[PDB]
Copies of this chain bind each other. A is one copy, B any other.
């Protein structure tokens, strides 16, 4: 039993390498830059005589005022990495059926946004490029998956200039020759900045959707990226850590392939053997999509677009977020694997066996718990669906019910929306999920603990 210490020291070396490699991914200016860009926009009010900012847009003229005053003020102080772009998606007149009774008063109807109802037709003063429908592929876009619906990559677009003299002119022309009519359903603003002394450039995508029932709904996405500003101070150390991480992964994979191939005919008959293979494959994928991401960022180190073309950096942001998520999962599993090295203790070996002997019962209880949880969530969605703003969608009903458990109920508007069947939901939920269903978890655990300890006592103390 000397290989246990070898595994322990190897795992500690791996963990110390990984902790440094993940502390190197917690730079201060990757989060503060986003927090300062999301306040440079989205918080500064309209030019003057208004207090509403982008976060509290309320009408179409408010959007026009934001585009003229606040947008053209925060972009230009007194780099852009190319040029900003603005796009519109709209629907077709007469795309739905007005009932015959309500006629002679309601002439036209505009259906809610859908690909089957979107129009592809020319506009009025049709001399620019912002008055002809260009196909989805010609705009180099895929989708957005917004709030109300999901929007295509097509639309009517207009590339802006690079200054307050050839930019505000076309915006004013668009406002004069009316562009956002009743048929508009979505408006996008896309651009990158690269205004940070450290490379750390971020792309931004602003959406304003006009629902089929009046009003505006704003949304925003800020996404910073990475570059290779290699210096002898801390960066060579992190490169060495990365390459030794790759060496550790190679050693682990050749080790595991050796044992799986040469003996036991099957490695997947435990829990620690079905976990490290997952860690290894996740690490391989992360290394691959990190090398590819670095190669992709390498070429685009241009900063010489000369306001002639619009950069398209969403393909890089997708890989960025995928790598971040996969690394976060890998680090978590690496930390979880630590239990194998402390489970063989004098007093820690009666709780591990207890929690492994009752896993089937715990899963069986969890299914029963979740069925009732989802039934309550659906009932709350059907009852308080249109009023409470907490139970507005199913994904929010579930997350609200998970917050009533943590002692965060509001109950001020639950009772206001429905005086009867509002309290009945709340009191019954509390009773049947705190007194009856959270006592079925500790019951299973207690029974398993008692029987395991009795068996261990009658085994050890007898022999």
* Inter-chain contact A381/B212, CB cutoff 8 Å: no
* Inter-chain contact A381/B26, CB cutoff 8 Å: yes
User: Contacts A382-B324, A393-B28 known; A430 to B449 CB distance under 8 Å?
Assistant: no
Across the interface, name the chain B residue whose C-beta is closest to A97.
Answer: B231
A274 interface contact, C-beta 8 A? no
A361 interface contact, C-beta 8 A? yes
A350 interface contact, C-beta 8 A? yes
A278 interface contact, C-beta 8 A? no
How close is A75's CB to chain B, nearest CB, in angstroms? 14
Interfacial chain B residues near A101, Cβ < 8 Å: 228, 304
Give the interface segment out of A6-14, A171-179, A288-296, A395-403: A395-403
User: Contacts A29-B213, A445-B439 known; A351 to B365 CB distance under 8 Å?
Assistant: yes
Q: Which of A374-389 contact B (CB under 8 A)?
A: 374-376, 378-379, 381-383, 385-387, 389
Interface string of A394-437 (1 = CB under 8 A from B): 01001100111111110100010010010100110010001110
Interfacial chain B residues near A406, Cβ < 8 Å: 404, 407, 409, 430
Copies of this chain, whole number: 2
A438 interface contact, C-beta 8 A? yes
Interfacial chain B residues near A32, Cβ < 8 Å: 148, 211, 213, 215, 217
Interfacial chain B residues near A106, Cβ < 8 Å: 79, 194, 196
Interface string of A108-123 (1 = CB under 8 A from B): 0111100000000000
Task: Please count how many residues in chain A sit with their CB below 8 Å of the partner chain's CB atoms.
Answer: 118
Interfacial chain B residues near A376, Cβ < 8 Å: 332
* Inter-chain contact A447/B445, CB cutoff 8 Å: no
Interface string of A70-107 (1 = CB under 8 A from B): 00000000010000000000000000111101100110
How close is A151's CB to chain B, nearest CB, in angstroms? 15
* Inter-chain contact B386/A34, CB cutoff 8 Å: yes
Interfacial chain B residues near A418, Cβ < 8 Å: 325
User: Contacts A214-B36, A328-B379, A382-B26 known; A111 to B197 CB distance under 8 Å?
Assistant: yes
Interfacial chain B residues near A362, Cβ < 8 Å: 436
* Inter-chain contact B387/A34, CB cutoff 8 Å: yes
Interfacial chain B residues near A96, Cβ < 8 Å: 197
A4 interface contact, C-beta 8 A? no
* Inter-chain contact B430/A213, CB cutoff 8 Å: no
How close is A63's CB to chain B, nearest CB, in angstroms? 15
User: Contacts A110-B197, A439-B446, A446-B446 known; A378 to B332 CB distance under 8 Å?
Assistant: yes
A189 interface contact, C-beta 8 A? no
* Inter-chain contact A403/B411, CB cutoff 8 Å: yes
Interfacial chain B residues near A393, Cβ < 8 Å: 28
How close is A423's CB to chain B, nearest CB, in angstroms? 6
Binding site for B on A (CB under 8 A): 22, 26, 28-36, 79, 96-99, 101-102, 105-106, 109-112, 148, 194-199, 211-215, 217, 224, 228, 231-232, 304, 307, 324-325, 327-329, 331-332, 335-336, 338-339, 342, 347-348, 350-351, 354, 360-362, 364-365, 367-368, 371-372, 374-376, 378-379, 381-383, 385-387, 389, 392-393, 395, 398-399, 402-409, 411, 415, 418, 421, 423, 426-427, 430, 434-436, 438-447, 449-450, 453
Closest 5 pairs between A and B when the two form their complex, measured CB to CB: A328-B382, A407-B407, A406-B407, A335-B375, A443-B446
